Automatic annotation (TrEMBL), chain B:
It comes from Pectobacterium phage PhiM1. The lineage of its organism: Viruses, Duplodnaviria, Heunggongvirae, Uroviricota, Caudoviricetes. It comes from the Viruses. This is Putative tail tubular protein B. The chain holds residues 341 to 485 of 776 of the full protein.
From TrEMBL, chain C:
It comes from the Viruses. It comes from Pectobacterium phage PhiM1. This is Putative tail tubular protein B. The chain holds residues 729 to 776 of 776 of the full protein.
């Protein structure tokens, strides 16, 4: 018999046949972490913060983001069904603004976009189209005379000859994006956009977005940007209210600019990102960029150029993770993918794209609906429309000019997920409890203590006081426990902090809970349970040159597990047609000083052994744990029985 | 005024999403001197914008450019083969790392260090080095993971 | 002070379940040039 060891467990899930999987990939991961330095352990619990003062019945009619005022940062929440706008403080303690806006009514929360130019935050709705308006004027067929190109009007009030565009010109716009102030009082007002003041229809044309509508929004070089399909429109330099060219006597550098594009079938740009000093444009079947130069962009140099031909999707806004940008693509009718783009380092603007999900073509159900970046903890989050109760994570690491880790895995939560956003070293998540919205956060890189208390292994946990072995069930858990969710209680203080305690009954009328005997009065936590499944990949035999041999002529005898800290867990081993092993295992023995009454039941270091006795590759192994104790796996070893009976050549 | 510095013989005053520069070699002149024409040496101001907000807080010269630091984005003022003029000044975004703004960046000869937050109660550090085979190009690394 | 010398310390315990520290708060220096150990490990099956 021979022995061996699995190299590592830090490359996440995979779906290729075992012959081809890279080193470190596993078969199943759920509610785990791919953390370096600490190993492959369980994720922390989700903490309850507060509930947003709004209501909703659907999972995608909510939008969330943040804005900075002075030294403070504030949240922005928009409800897209009734058209409501909210502003909240960073700690969810006060409401700074609350009003209704008929302009913000749309079918889904994917039509909202924002930008900021001088001192205000603009909000654009891509599902509505603007129109021209003509106001009353004193012009006559206020006589008008034409010099030479240029048109003049005569102001009888002072006898001056001021310029005027022409008869019948528009004097404003309707259905344009609204604006919000950031000076510290949060005023909302619809700005007054300018009509034509100079030029005729043959020398000052429409901006172009009148006909194709507005399908995007953004800022670039101090100019507001409005995408109108195959056209790009930009306002005046530092003046968001000017869209027509101001004067006709010459051509001014600072005046607005519009630029056209074309292709073999069609183009419709939908999103924009700045990134590497350029401006990037995304569409279904092609991609383009607006080159930068050694001089500020002018009407005589703007252009659009195509660069690649990948097919992508357009439901989710691209995200930036510091050194790269992520955008989604469709794999098939019912599954999604992801692509990544990185810039060159030895020249001017040059880009190359890679596919980083080819090995899991059926792991992401439906269409990707969101993308979030957390550069402070090296991770990212995705939300899919195929399953509304799961969140997909990625973990990445960089070394010099090389990428080393691309771990993928899945999480789950007790309530449907609505939206997510990142503000100052945290990620927030909203969930729909009935018709009310909650807020919770998960911080994997935090210690084991929060303000003199020990964090439990439960979701959406709150603190409560217990007196006479009785207390009242908090409101936000009545719905979950009523639908099969498991109620979990733990100590909150003293040496026994973190240990499990149980309950005996719940009054159907008053929701009073009675705990087990001999629990003293004090502080306690209350929450819900979850599982932390994991499943390694079967071993392999590999000769000197790396070729794989003996796929049908090898037998597996045993597993060896080394654990940094853990309690009892559950293991199941099954074969093609029958179960082989089953039952609980532990690394804490009766002769260890770690086992004491009134102390946690964990061992700082230990080992476990599991028998298999079956063909190596025709096996499936899983390890579960859904209790107050951790499960950290440092290494795995096995015993293999393989016997060659002829030389090789 | 949220910042201060010097560049190309011109005083620099940061005003959040705007950058202000005085006249060439004359720190007391901030308004444009004459209107009959446009003079190269007169002061210049340039605007910036982003998806959420920007507020520049510090500046460093380093590799022949001028670097601007903020919470969620970073920008640079490109150099050229001719002295900066009112008709060529611009601000361009280059990366998207999240950082902090309490400590001024430091220079150690071949690199520049600026701090970032790890979590509510712990801090980190980042480093930025220039490319050697082309014009202004930068890349950042994390050296406290 | 001695210009060159050596010291020996016994442990007799599991390799990774240990913590070692060396302190000095007096007028003499403490310069460590190299460290060596004796390890007792015995495999009882071939590897493959």
């Amino acid at each position: 018999a021979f022995d061996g060891s699995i190299k590592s467990l830090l490359q996440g899930v995979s779906q290729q046949v075992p012959r081809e999987r890279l080193d470190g990939q596993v078969s199943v991961q759920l509610n785990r972490l791919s953390d370096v330095v600490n190993g492959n352990r369980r994720r922390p619990g989700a903490r309850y913060l507060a509930d947003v003062p709004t209501t909703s019945q659907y999972d995608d009619h909510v939008f969330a983001s943040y804005v900075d005022v002075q030294d403070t940062a504030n949240h922005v929440i928009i409800n897209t069904e009734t058209g409501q706008l909210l502003v909240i403080s960073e700690d969810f303690s006060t409401t700074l603004h609350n009003s209704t806006q008929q302009y913000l009514v749309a079918s889904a929360a994917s039509a909202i976009q924002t930008a900021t130019l001088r001192g205000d935050l603009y909000i654009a709705n891509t599902e509505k189209a603007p129109t021209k308006v003509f106001g009353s004027t004193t012009q006559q067929d206020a006589s008008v005379a034409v010099g030479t190109f240029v048109w003049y009007q005569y102001d009888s009030a002072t006898s001056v000859w001021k310029e005027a565009g022409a008869y019948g010109s528009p004097t404003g716009f309707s259905n344009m994006p609204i604006r919000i102030s950031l000076d510290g009082v949060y005023t909302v007002e619809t700005p007054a956009y300018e009509g034509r003041l100079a030029g005729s229809d043959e020398t000052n044309e429409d901006p172009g977005f009148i006909d194709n509508g507005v399908t995007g929004f953004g800022a670039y070089q101090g100019r507001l940007v409005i995408l109108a399909g195959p056209e790009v429109c930009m306002s005046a330099a530092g003046n968001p209210l000017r869209w027509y060219r101001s004067t006709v006597t010459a051509l001014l550098t600072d005046d607005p600019i519009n630029i056209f594009s074309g292709a073999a079938t069609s183009t419709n740009f939908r999103h924009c990102v700045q990134f590497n000093k350029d401006l990037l444009l995304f569409a279904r079947s092609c991609q383009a960029v607006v080159p930068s130069s050694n001089a500020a962009i002018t009407p005589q140099t703007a252009q659009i150029v195509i660069t690649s031909g990948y097919t992508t999707d357009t439901l989710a806004q691209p995200g930036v993770v510091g050194r790269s940008v992520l955008y989604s693509m469709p794999r098939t009718e019912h599954f999604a993918g992801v692509l990544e783009i990185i810039p060159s380092n030895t020249t001017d603007s040059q880009y190359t794209s890679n596919d980083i999900t080819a090995h899991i073509p059926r792991y992401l159900p439906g269409r990707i609906r969101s993308i979030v970046s957390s550069t402070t903890s090296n991770s990212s989050a995705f939300i899919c429309t195929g399953d509304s109760r799961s969140l997909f994570i990625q973990d990445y690491l960089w070394s010099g000019d090389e990428k080393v880790q691309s771990a993928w895995h899945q999480w789950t939560l007790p309530y449907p997920i609505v939206c997510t956003w990142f503000v100052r070293d945290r990620v927030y998540i909203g969930m729909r409890d009935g018709t009310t919205i909650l807020v919770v956060t998960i911080e994997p890189q935090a210690g084991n203590t929060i303000d003199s208390y020990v964090r439990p292994f439960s979701d959406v946990y709150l603190r409560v006081t217990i007196t006479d072995r009785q207390f009242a069930l908090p409101t936000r858990l009545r719905a979950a426990v009523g639908s099969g969710e498991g109620l979990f209680i733990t100590f909150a203080d003293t040496s026994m902090g973190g240990m499990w305690v149980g309950y005996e009954s719940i009054d159907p009328t008053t929701y009073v809970v009675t705990t087990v005997r001999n629990v003293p009065d004090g502080e306690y936590f209350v929450g819900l349970r979850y599982t932390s499944v994991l499943s390694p990949t079967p071993p392999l035999v590999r000769d000197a040159n790396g070729i794989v041999i003996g796929t049908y002529q090898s037998l597996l005898v045993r597993y060896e597990l080394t654990l940094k800290d853990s309690g009892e867990f559950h293991a199941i081993i099954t074969d093609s047609s029958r179960t082989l092993t089953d039952g609980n295992y532990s690394s804490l023995v009766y002769s260890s000083t770690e086992l004491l009454p009134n102390n946690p039941t964990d061992a700082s270091l230990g080992r476990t052994i599991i028998p298999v006795r079956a063909q190596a590759q025709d096996t499936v192994a899983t390890f579960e744990a859904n209790a107050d104790t951790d499960l950290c796996i440092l290494d795995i070893e096995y015993v293999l029985q393989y016997r060659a009976r002829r030389k090789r050549i």
